[PDB]
Write a protein that binds this ligand. Sequence first.
Ligand code: CLA
Ligand code: CLA
Ligand code: CLA
Ligand code: CLA
Ligand code: CLA
Ligand code: CLA
Lengths: 141, 742, 63, 39, 29, 153, 80, 90
Amino acid sequence: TPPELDPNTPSPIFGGSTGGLLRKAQVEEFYVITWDSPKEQIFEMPTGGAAIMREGPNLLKLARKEQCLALGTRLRSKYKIKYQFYRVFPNGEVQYLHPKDGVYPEKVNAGRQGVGQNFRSIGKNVSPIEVKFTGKQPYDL
Amino acid sequence: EVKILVDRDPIKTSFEQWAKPGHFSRTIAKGPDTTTWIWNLHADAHDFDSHTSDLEEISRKVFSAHFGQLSIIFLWLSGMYFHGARFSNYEAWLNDPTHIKPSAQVVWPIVGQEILNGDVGGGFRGIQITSGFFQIWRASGITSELQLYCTAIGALVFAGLMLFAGWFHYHKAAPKLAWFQDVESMLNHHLAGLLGLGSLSWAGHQVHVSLPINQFLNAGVDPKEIPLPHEFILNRDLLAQLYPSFAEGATPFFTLNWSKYADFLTFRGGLDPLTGGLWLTDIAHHHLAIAILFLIAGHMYRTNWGIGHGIKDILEAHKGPFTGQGHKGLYEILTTSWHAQLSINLAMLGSLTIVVAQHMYSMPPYPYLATDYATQLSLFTHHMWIGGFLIVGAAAHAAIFMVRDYDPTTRYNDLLDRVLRHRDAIISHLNWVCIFLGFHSFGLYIHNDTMSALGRPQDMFSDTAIQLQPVFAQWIQNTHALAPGTTAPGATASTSLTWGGGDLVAVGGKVALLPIPLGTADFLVHHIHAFTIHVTVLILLKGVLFARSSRLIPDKANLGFRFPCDGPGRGGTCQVSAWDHVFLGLFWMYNSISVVIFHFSWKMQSDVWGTINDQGVVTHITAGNFAQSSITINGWLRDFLWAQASQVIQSYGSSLSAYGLFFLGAHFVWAFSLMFLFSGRGYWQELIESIVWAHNKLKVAPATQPRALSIVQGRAVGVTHYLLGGIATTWAFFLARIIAVG
Amino acid sequence: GPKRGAKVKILRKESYWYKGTGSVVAVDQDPNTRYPVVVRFNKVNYANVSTNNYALDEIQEVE
Amino acid sequence: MRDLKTYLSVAPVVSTLWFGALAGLLIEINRFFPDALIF
Amino acid sequence: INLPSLFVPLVGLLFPAVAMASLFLHVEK
Amino acid sequence: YQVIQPINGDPFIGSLETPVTSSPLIAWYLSNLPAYRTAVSPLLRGIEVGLAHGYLLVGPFVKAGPLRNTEIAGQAGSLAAGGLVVILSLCLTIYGISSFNEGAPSTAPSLTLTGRKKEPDQLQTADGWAKFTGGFFFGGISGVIWAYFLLYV
Amino acid sequence: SHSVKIYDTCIGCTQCVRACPTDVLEMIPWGGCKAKQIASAPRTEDCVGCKRCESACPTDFLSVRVYLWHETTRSMGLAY
Amino acid sequence: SVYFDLEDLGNTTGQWDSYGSDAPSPYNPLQSKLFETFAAPFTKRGLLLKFLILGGGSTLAYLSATASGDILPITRGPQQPPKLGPRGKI
Ligand code: CLA
Ligand code: CLA
Ligand code: CLA
Ligand code: CLA
Ligand code: CLA
Ligand code: CLA
């Protein structure tokens, strides 16, 4: 399945705060979260203060991914509304982040390959002396 | 339509809930699996918000709770009066206030504690009290132990009535939410009925009982020989002998010839030379005027008739270009959230207790109070502490509102939102001003210490080197001293002797009050005060403004008001909760108040208190060393702490020995807090694992699994023992010092 | 494996109830289940949990 | 009444009464046999 | 007293300046 | 009408537009400061900045220093001011060496408030910062000397 | 970045995944437990190391483990 | 009415010059030449660093080694007779 496209949709109503983007957005990376609201309504900003989401498509730029998943969590939990978010680099490149494969990570979905899964109980990790002078950790085996 | 709204029998009265610990919480009611349960039971006992979502039930709970508190206080007053009647030297003290030490506690003779019953005078052996009850009782016109007994009985009765009122207004007739929400009516009744009629009727007691009996006492007549208070009401001839105005009855009052009442309603100011206290005539007039003011003030808000303001209207009327909607929405917030109210009221009540401390030192309202240095020092310190604590509480509950009750989707306010939108600027600015203040106050002290150590006193900041005069405060002093002649013609003297100009009031050979000089040292300490207060504000305000979210923790609000952290991630997020900000703010409040009470103690012992010789030679307790000694940390270390701790450290074998014991005990508890503050519960849990093993080996392991305290409780225990320790230390120090050299 | 309600000793070293005894609730018959032996304990762990899954070599039927 | 008795049997009340009784005992003993340094 | 007037400001002012600048540049690279 | 608005219209950039931040008087004032002369040689900027700073620096050293009450007050104070000028020049120098590589281009903004492109400040380059520091040293010492002259000669 | 590992004592209650504030974990098909699923950590570059996941895990001992490792601007939770 | 543009990431992230003015040099041309010729030696950061360190150290050493007794009490030395120690020790 192909990821969601990212157009220029209007941003929520807000008078502006001091909790928004900084130089990190300019030099390193920032983030963008989009959602579709049934009506105009008030929501609390992750960066502090109250804003108004418009009806239809909404696009909000945040400084951290955690802020994005926080806002999105509040959207899905309180306003019963689906959301997505991407990471954006200064060169213009956009990386689709969440939800990765179109399905929320809470519920299982075929197609996902395991990462960092050790097929052994945690107590069966080797002692540090077993990995001395190697680059390996007892949990990397 | 403001009216009496009440539900009948909301809760059945039964001991069934008494036999079920933690009934208020579904979690705690299930019982203990670990020992943690126990602590929780006490931690959430009065957190009614975590009990129910219903604002009404919470409101009822707080109402009856308040009744319980008032009951306790009445029982306390009852105790004080009863001990003043049965176990004291009060009458003897009345006979000779200047050479008898106030005592109203005696100890039983076991294990040698009998030594605590010291020679307080009046042919009595006991513990010298510093609460100041004797001067109050003298001011109220009380002369016998019988009257104290009667007041005790009255207070006990009132305790019963308050308790019954609690039970009644919780179990039998519990007010509706609309009733509690009638804020216009509550404000009216509290302004006019409580304060107004309070000071009015008190002015009644003062004019009919206090003034005459005190006039007699001051005349010198034996207390037993003084006419009983009821006689001054029955026989107007006596009052007429004392104040001829009463010969014309209440006629000059209604005929607007108020000038005729200048006999007992004066406006002299200053202090009565033969008592060292404010003029009781001035006090009676004060309470009368205050009564009028509050009485008319209690008719401001609209209730059941057209006249009167609406709070919401006044709020919604105030909105500017900088603030947009202004104070709109605040009425709804302040009529649905107990925590916001508690915040405001704690801040203001604390501030009030502070102003009470200052005003009571500088304008002694009770007879023979200013020369009872022990009592004055005690009162100042006490009320200062109470104030600081209440203020920190204001921060706590502000934050608690911020987490639990704030909801911008249903109860929005523009001012709060705008505050939240530039919180970074506010906190950063407070930060900077704190660093600046710290440098330019403490740095002056370190500068002085260094110059003094290097043999360069001419390079210090002092009155004899680089001067830093409190010009503004000096100007205010001069202005207030010259006021009686210019801007307050009807006033005879100044409102306080402490102003830059004036004479000197002494009683019984001791200095009551004199003009307080302000120099470089005072500039220094005042800026220290500004610094410490600013830091405390920084911590607390940062705590409440970032209680909901930060760039670090975007969803902090969901973690609650009180939680240890959000893990070692993000570099480490310990103490991010607003509760932890209350926790740090407590330490800083302790710091500030400590340096404040040290300031008061040293200044009073150095430039004010002391004995006065004939021809006017004043010898102060520490001989005016403040101006030269308080400009270095070493000066406080040696001339204040080291020098004055003498009395406490050699108090053994005397009646003041309990203060030595408490000195050591407080030091101990203080150090003991550091174990909790410096450590963490993981270590303690593992140690507990080993000990539990040992208990299992001998079949004595408890079913309620021994658990280390939570992180938060570790912090709470820490700060509690820290405060108790430090404060009790300064307590013992102060009391032993001032009782021995006073 | 052991029966239901059987008193077993815990052999998993990293367990809160290691070297202690618990009671068997149910054993999963699915051979793909890595830890079938469901055990319940008299005392809760540091996570307020009173039940845990173990393998056949992590329990020892005793009495 | 049974509930009240149960309440009186709760840990803090039991402790107050027990340590109250102990305090009374030790006090009276130290009043009758005072200044004991031996035995 | 001759040498100390030379060596003291040398070790107390010049040396720590040189060292701090050097370490700064080293750590920033 | 309202007074406070989002920074340059963007409500999600971490700042606000107030009379303090953006009003004609302050804007004109700051834009005419040697630091914001974004189109002129950093050398001259450095000369101005250093001149002003050394000049002000002479003041507090002379009156507050250890030799304030001696016939050798001005010499001592001015010398100390020159010393701080040297030290700050050293600070500026190491800042330049550490922050900018000789190859790296300007890190200054390349846009205006309106959003049009413009030539980035050459103050944020290695050569530019080196020139600025030279100017701060020259102008600094010169300012100290000038102030000392006005005060004691 | 921090390191996050899942062990086969996992019973797939999904509690850890819905506890992560930065979307690091997810559930994948598996046959080792009745829930027919196991946790996984494909996005530890966004991991901050708060350990909410570990606090959410029911198993004894933990089936999810977070070893704080190399420190980055994302793992430090910085927004500047 | 939007604030997101991939082609213009500059305006998107507020990378603006708030107070930088494109105005030409307002300075004195003669003074400009004066400074551009006389302040030039200090515009090489390595050479400037070496000069400030070595020169600064040299100056400090000069004023230190030749400090008068009327300025520094440490160079003037003791002028009063020495006092005896606590236990009759020199
Ligand atoms: C806060 C107020 C207060 C405080 C701090 C004190 C403190 C004191 N009083 Mg005072 N007293 C007070 C109010 C107070 N009193 C009031 C309002 C009255 C009028 C009734 C009195 C009448 C009074 C008298 C006549 C005497 C004192 C005495 C004393 C001293 C010794 C107390 C003692 O050993 O009791 C005795 C100890 C006990 C009774 C211990 C029993 C505790 C039980 C076992 C606890 C059980 C728990 C249970 C829940 C509590 C009962 C609840 C009840 C509803 C059933 C002590 C300084 C004595 C004194 O000063 O001698 C020189 C003394 O003779 N008091
Ligand atoms: C006298 C008979 C009586 C009986 C049988 C009850 C029974 C009940 N009350 Mg009621 N109530 C009463 C009188 C009574 N009350 C009085 C006199 C008041 C006014 C204070 C109230 C006001 C009131 C409120 C506000 C609430 C109750 C509640 C309850 C129910 C649960 C309370 C409980 O079990 O904890 C028993 C509590 C204790 C055993 C502790 C007593 C705490 C004392 C009073 C505080 C003062 C102690 C003081 C600080 C001493 C410390 C000394 C030193 C160690 C520091 C229970 C049905 C609660 C309820 O219904 O919840 C749904 C509830 O919220 N009552
Ligand atoms: C105006 C009075 C007032 C009232 C009605 C409240 C009410 C409340 N506070 Mg607040 N608060 C206040 C003032 C007040 N506070 C002040 C002055 C401070 C500064 C210290 C605070 C700081 C504060 C914090 C940090 C917290 C609260 C919390 C609460 C809530 C739970 C309280 C509870 O159940 O604890 C039960 C009561 C106790 C456990 C009492 C024990 C306290 C110590 C151990 C006693 C100190 C020792 C004593 C001085 C001497 C001991 C002698 C001897 C026994 C050794 C409750 C709504 C809590 C909350 O969660 O709110 C939602 C919370 O976390 N308050
Ligand atoms: C190694 C131990 C040691 C210590 C603690 C001191 C301490 C002192 N020396 Mg002495 N010095 C030492 C060895 C030491 N010296 C030796 C071996 C010589 C013979 C070369 C000298 C020659 C000397 C002279 C001529 C003078 C001092 C002076 C002083 C005083 C001022 C500091 C100073 O400027 O000296 C500077 C010290 C040197 C130039 C010699 C040290 C060179 C060695 C070989 C290298 C040291 C590197 C060091 C370990 C690095 C540490 C920093 C690093 C960890 C970051 C100070 C009390 C001054 C004084 O007495 O004023 C009253 C002074 O005028 N020292
Ligand atoms: C440990 C090494 C060290 C040494 C040798 C000195 C020496 C001195 N300090 Mg101290 N100082 C130090 C560390 C040191 N400081 C530290 C660590 C602190 C912070 C705690 C201070 C805080 C301090 C203050 C606040 C003051 C001093 C002052 C002084 C001067 C004494 C006053 C005087 O009458 O001189 C006579 C001084 C003059 C006549 C003017 C000096 C002009 C200098 C010599 C020109 C040097 C120029 C050159 C470019 C310096 C570059 C050095 C760099 C490249 C390494 C003296 C030169 C006083 C001062 O500087 O007076 C101006 C002074 O007010 N110091
Ligand atoms: C933090 C408080 C503080 C203050 C105000 C002072 C002040 C002073 N110290 Mg002291 N000193 C301090 C702490 C302080 N010290 C501490 C903690 C120590 C122990 C380490 C010392 C150790 C020490 C020594 C050994 C000596 C001094 C000396 C001095 C004097 C000269 C200092 C100097 O030459 O600096 C230069 C001054 C400046 C560079 C001023 C800069 C600040 C300006 C005003 C900033 C302006 C910003 C502006 C208002 C913002 C708006 C800008 C806009 C208008 C454009 C001066 C009175 C010397 C002396 O002899 O005193 C008599 C001296 O020998 N100090």
